[PDB]
Design a binder for this molecule. Structure first.
Ligand SMILES: [Mg+2]
Ligand SMILES: [Mg+2]
Ligand SMILES: [Mg+2]
Ligand SMILES: [Mg+2]
Ligand SMILES: [Mg+2]
Ligand SMILES: [Mg+2]
Ligand SMILES: [Mg+2]
Ligand SMILES: [Mg+2]
Ligand SMILES: [Mg+2]
Ligand SMILES: [Mg+2]
Ligand SMILES: [Mg+2]
Ligand SMILES: [Mg+2]
Ligand SMILES: [Mg+2]
Ligand SMILES: [Mg+2]
Ligand SMILES: [Mg+2]
Ligand SMILES: [Mg+2]
Ligand SMILES: [Mg+2]
Ligand SMILES: [Mg+2]
Ligand SMILES: [Mg+2]
Ligand SMILES: [Mg+2]
Ligand SMILES: [Mg+2]
Ligand SMILES: [Mg+2]
Ligand SMILES: [Mg+2]
Ligand SMILES: [Mg+2]
Ligand SMILES: [Mg+2]
Ligand SMILES: [Mg+2]
Ligand SMILES: [Mg+2]
Ligand SMILES: [Mg+2]
Ligand SMILES: [Mg+2]
Ligand SMILES: [Mg+2]
Ligand SMILES: [Mg+2]
Ligand SMILES: [Zn+2]
Ligand SMILES: [Zn+2]
Lengths: 127, 91, 202, 97, 214, 25, 97
RNA sequence: GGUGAAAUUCUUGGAUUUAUUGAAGACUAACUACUGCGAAAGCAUUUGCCAAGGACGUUUUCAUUAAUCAAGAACGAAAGUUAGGGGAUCGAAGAUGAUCAGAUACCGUCGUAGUCUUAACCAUAAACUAUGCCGACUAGGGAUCGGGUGGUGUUUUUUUAAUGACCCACUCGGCACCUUACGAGAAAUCAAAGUCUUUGGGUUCUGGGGGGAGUAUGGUCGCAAGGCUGAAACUUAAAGGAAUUG
């Protein structure tokens, strides 16, 4: 009821991304989430780190000012596990709690019509 | 009786130049010598000479074509896409 | 004689005099005797006709394309060669196309081309099989055959000349800035060795 | 000898079934033999849904979730997901539970 | 500090005549100085607004919409139609095992020359007294249905303009305008108009876009 | 050794032996 | 198809094959329909069409060269034009053609 | 970025992210099942065309025209070979980064051939149901696919039928499952793997302790890689199967 934008959340495995932008698409945000406050190189996806960096995300969001925004979350997907990452939900929650208004949501995880064969061969990763 | 098991028309070259070179030649050789079917009269009377020139014995027409076959794969595919791009400029 | 692709003699009326003028075109694959050819901007898109690159849509196939509007044919003239129109910039009225070499040059839309591909394609697929056929081939082009390997000559005859064994003796790649007399071998070669890979520019 | 009458899973009278590849290791596995689990997990958590709704527009309009079908490779399936190796006669029970 | 907070201007947008309310909100684009300025490089975007977001009760919440910005003047930024789509939640919830899916599409034009490919989605309905958990159709049915869907589909489009086209699918009765035909062939739960996507349009025609304001 | 590897070892072995007497062909 | 409706005229009615016989038919008016192969030249086409209009005879352009028209009329040779004089029971003189 | 963790790697070239957007080749997700089809290989977006096929239905026709089959032939996954095209993807090779005592690997990176398509080959897969085909007989059970029959069964309501979908009962042919054991089996198990010392419906094929060895040799097929046919000398007391206990 006050203002709108875009969330653009993305949670990979061993990294995660979050960045707002105008609902017109090209626009901008500040966008630095993944290995920004956490630098151990394996805690990149970690939820304790997703919030630590998502915090500074809402900061700039409100620094220039956006009260409400809807989400568009996306997993690495495409051709590798089509599923949310650890720091995906652990970030917008720390931000919805940051005094942010949300609403209509849907994910944009890319899924194909069974093509572009994956890595690892027919025997896959062996361990 | 069958005269040659494999050489066919390439037997003129005898034993020289290697089986591979001779074999591949026979391929284009067969094509450039055979009689094709004429598109303007319906009779198979169009033969080559002066590669890229295919003329019908009767009806006297001369068609430009591949060096060894009347229609080359590329030209045939072009005919298709030219029809496509053309059907696209009246309707 | 001396050309792989066949020629096409096309007769036209002289719009300024009661007289016939006979142009000599390169026969595109499919053209036939007694065919009707159309030439101009407001012409149809039929294989054989000649239209400016602007008047044709993307993906068209043309040969004997003009580098500049009105040079009577400069590109895609060898047996079975063609160029493809891959775009138009109606402002500056340019038209970007792909040549047989793969290079993508942009030229004026008023430049002309003939719909289709050149005839006599696939001539190079048949081996020559004997020096005689190569001999007769060049008997009509020029005195460029046969070729003596510079490594079989004495030093007085070539850089690669001389030696108690047949060898080049120094790098076969030669600088572009080289001088006439030393530019023999791989000139300005940016690479060398057997090409193993994609072999098609993106 | 055999230790299952299907010797795979769900395939009698077809010869060949297009193969799917495991979500965990990408290894190929025939669709008829791939253990399938549809993961319908919400955007929710224990204490994350209340913060989500109070300080927001749209006072709990839809609340949608994640929907995607997963296919595993028996080797991977046995490692983490539902394999739960059974007993000689307890395995013939196809009751999902 | 570069401080791109006081950086540029915010522009406004609304929606065409079709809907009840039209306030889109605002966006941020760039300084309007002419070196390479606004407008000439501005109206080439689109936004993702839900339908109930600008129409009303969410009895139309599934449908997502794209609005192609076309022309702008001093703080005007009005955007015409660009397409639509369903949402993962709805579609992924409609694809239930133990039933057969049906998808079909057609490419037509309206009068407002635009050639469009639409999409439709339908499933199988279990009869009230049914006892089989499979609830499946038969190829003869599925092919026949597609035909009537295709036939019906290219009636509204090429039957009116883009405006009435948008005004035709928002009531969604075409969804069951299929059902009267399918009621004689198969139950068919969840019959919809799931997606639409386009290619081009005649040149801008500045005068026609102004017939969506008031 | 593995079954299919014994095959490969044998296939190689015959290829080598095959070559060896073609020298005396 | 129409090859069917036409194939009944050879076994039932009267016809004439060939460019020359077909024109004497068009001059005497006995022709009610003439079939012209696809590959036949345009000059002869317009000529036959002229004679047809003079004999008020209808024409049908057979999609397929004279080779196809010949094997269609049951003959083993190219047929550039056919002129029907009596369609014994074929609806060819009454169908959409 | 990638992983268990890292590193080779990529980033004044604004990378990863976003936006509009185009190209290329590949694939058909979800729907998808103890579901369908084909001789097997094998077959999943649309539509048009091309011929083709089983089950059913049948008071139609022919009337033993058949069953099974050495020789011979049609097709035959994958990879692989020849000539074009294609070459997006993933990716033998190779080269790398990491690991390890070592690490030619597994994990990561690059990436050739390949992957795809046309024309021609090659003819092998745990090509599996590790289970010949035709015929008959023997046993209980509820699902399901296709055809069919039966109705003062429900729904569509239009105004009720006609229909269509659904319900029920039956019958023929399908893919299977379940419970039984008369019965079989060395057992695991099997409606055939049963109707066998109470041994005979028709017919095809193969096997005769383990190695040696699918080796040698001849023949033949193939461009090759290889396919098919296929020994012996010698050596050896076990090798093997299913089940039981540890
Ligand atoms: Mg493991
Ligand atoms: Mg000389
Ligand atoms: Mg030389
Ligand atoms: Mg020389
Ligand atoms: Mg010398
Ligand atoms: Mg010198
Ligand atoms: Mg020198
Ligand atoms: Mg020297
Ligand atoms: Mg030398
Ligand atoms: Mg075991
Ligand atoms: Mg299987
Ligand atoms: Mg198989
Ligand atoms: Mg031993
Ligand atoms: Mg020797
Ligand atoms: Mg599909
Ligand atoms: Mg014999
Ligand atoms: Mg490649
Ligand atoms: Mg290596
Ligand atoms: Mg290890
Ligand atoms: Mg190493
Ligand atoms: Mg190695
Ligand atoms: Mg890789
Ligand atoms: Mg075998
Ligand atoms: Mg098997
Ligand atoms: Mg069985
Ligand atoms: Mg055995
Ligand atoms: Mg029974
Ligand atoms: Mg009934
Ligand atoms: Mg039955
Ligand atoms: Mg018992
Ligand atoms: Mg017993
Ligand atoms: Zn002719
Ligand atoms: Zn796996």
């Amino acid at each position: 009821s006050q203002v709108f934008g875009v969330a653009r959340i993305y949670a990979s495995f061993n990294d995660t991304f979050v960045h707002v932008t105008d609902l017109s698409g090209k626009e901008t945000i500040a966008r630095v989430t993944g290995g920004m406050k956490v630098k151990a190189d394996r805690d990149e996806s970690s939820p304790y780190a997703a919030m630590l960096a998502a915090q500074d995300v809402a900061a700039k969001c409100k620094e220039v000012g956006i009260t409400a925004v809807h989400v568009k979350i996306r997993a690495t997907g495409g051709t590798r596990t089509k599923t949310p990452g650890p720091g995906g939900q652990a970030a917008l929650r720390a931000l919805a709690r940051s005094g942010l208004r949300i609403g209509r949501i849907e994910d944009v995880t890319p899924v194909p019509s069974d093509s572009t064969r994956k890595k690892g061969g027919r025997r896959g990763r062996r361990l | 009786a069958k005269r040659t098991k494999k050489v066919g028309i390439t037997g003129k070259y005898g034993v020289r130049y290697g089986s591979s070179l001779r074999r591949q030649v026979k391929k284009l050789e067969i094509q450039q010598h055979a009689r094709y079917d004429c598109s303007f009269c319906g009779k198979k009377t169009v033969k080559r000479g002066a590669a890229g020139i295919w003329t019908c014995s009767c009806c006297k027409k001369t068609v430009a074509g591949g060096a060894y076959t009347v229609s080359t794969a590329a030209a045939a595919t072009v005919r298709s896409t030219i029809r496509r791009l053309r059907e696209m400029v009246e309707a | 004689s001396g050309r792989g692709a066949p020629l096409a003699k096309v007769v036209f009326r002289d719009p300024y005099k009661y007289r016939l003028r006979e142009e000599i075109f390169i026969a595109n694959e499919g053209v036939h005797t007694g065919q009707f050819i159309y030439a101009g901007k407001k012409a149809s898109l039929n294989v054989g006709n000649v239209l400016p690159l602007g008047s044709v849509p993307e993906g068209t196939i043309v040969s004997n394309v003009e580098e500049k509007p009105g040079d009577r044919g400069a590109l895609a003239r060898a047996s079975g060669n063609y160029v493809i129109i891959i775009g138009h910039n109606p402002d500056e009225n340019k038209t970007r196309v792909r040549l047989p070499s793969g290079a993508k040059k942009v030229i004026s839309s008023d430049a002309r081309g003939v719909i289709g591909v050149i005839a006599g394609g696939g001539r190079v697929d048949k081996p020559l099989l004997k020096a005689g056929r190569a001999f007769h081939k060049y008997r009509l082009k020029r005195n460029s055959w046969p070729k003596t390997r510079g490594v079989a000559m004495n030093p007085v005859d070539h850089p690669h000349g001389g030696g108690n064994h047949q060898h080049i003796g120094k790098a076969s790649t030669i600088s572009r800035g080289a001088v006439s007399g030393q530019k023999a071998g791989l000139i300005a070669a940016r690479r060398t060795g057997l090409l193993r890979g994609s072999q098609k520019t993106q | 000898p055999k230790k299952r009458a299907s010797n795979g899973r769900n395939k009698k009278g077809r010869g060949h079934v297009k193969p799917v590849r495991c979500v965990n290791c990408s290894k190929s596995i025939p669709k008829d033999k791939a253990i399938k689990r549809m993961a319908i997990r919400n955007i929710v958590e224990a204490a994350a849904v209340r913060d989500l709704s109070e300080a927001s527009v749209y006072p709990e309009y839809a609340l949608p979730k994640t929907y995607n079908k997963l296919h595993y490779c028996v080797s991977c399936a046995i490692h983490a997901r539902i394999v739960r190796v059974r007993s000689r006669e307890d395995r013939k029970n196809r009751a999902p539970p | 500090v570069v401080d791109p907070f006081t950086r540029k201007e915010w522009f406004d947008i609304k929606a065409p005549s079709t809907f009840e309310n039209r306030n889109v909100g605002k966006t941020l684009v760039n300084k309007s100085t002419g070196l390479k300025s606004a407008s000439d490089a501005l109206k080439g975007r689109v936004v993702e607004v839900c339908l109930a977001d600008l129409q009303g009760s969410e009895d139309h919440s599934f449908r997502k919409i794209k609005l192609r910005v076309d022309e702008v003047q001093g703080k005007n930024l009005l955007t015409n139609f660009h397409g639509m789509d369903f949402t993962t939640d709805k579609l992924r919830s409609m694809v239930r095992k133990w039933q057969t899916l049906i998808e079909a599409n057609v490419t037509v034009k309206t009068s407002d020359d635009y050639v469009l490919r639409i999409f439709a989605i339908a499933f199988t309905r279990k009869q009230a007294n049914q006892v089989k958990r499979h609830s499946y159709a038969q190829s003869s049915h599925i092919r026949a249905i597609r035909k009537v869907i295709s036939e019906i589909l290219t009636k509204e489009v090429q039957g009116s303009t883009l405006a009435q086209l948008t005004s035709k699918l928002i009531p969604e009765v075409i969804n069951k305008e299929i059902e009267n035909a399918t009621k004689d062939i198969f139950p068919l739960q969840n019959i919809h108009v799931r997606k639409v996507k386009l290619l081009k349009q005649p040149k801008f025609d500045v005068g026609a876009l102004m017939a969506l304001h008031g | 050794m593995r079954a299919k590897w014994r095959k490969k070892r044998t296939r190689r072995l015959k290829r080598k032996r095959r070559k060896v007497r073609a020298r005396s062909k | 198809s129409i090859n069917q409706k036409l194939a009944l005229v050879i076994k039932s009615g009267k016809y004439t094959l060939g460019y020359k016989s077909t024109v004497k038919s068009l001059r005497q008016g006995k022709s009610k329909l003439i079939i012209i192969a696809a590959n036949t030249p345009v000059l002869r086409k317009s000529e036959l069409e002229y004679y047809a209009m003079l004999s008020k005879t209808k024409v049908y352009y057979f999609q397929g060269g004279n080779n196809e028209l010949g094997t269609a009329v049951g003959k083993l040779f190219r047929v550039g034009v056919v002129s029907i004089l009596e369609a014994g029971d074929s609806d060819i003189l009454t169908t959409l053609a």
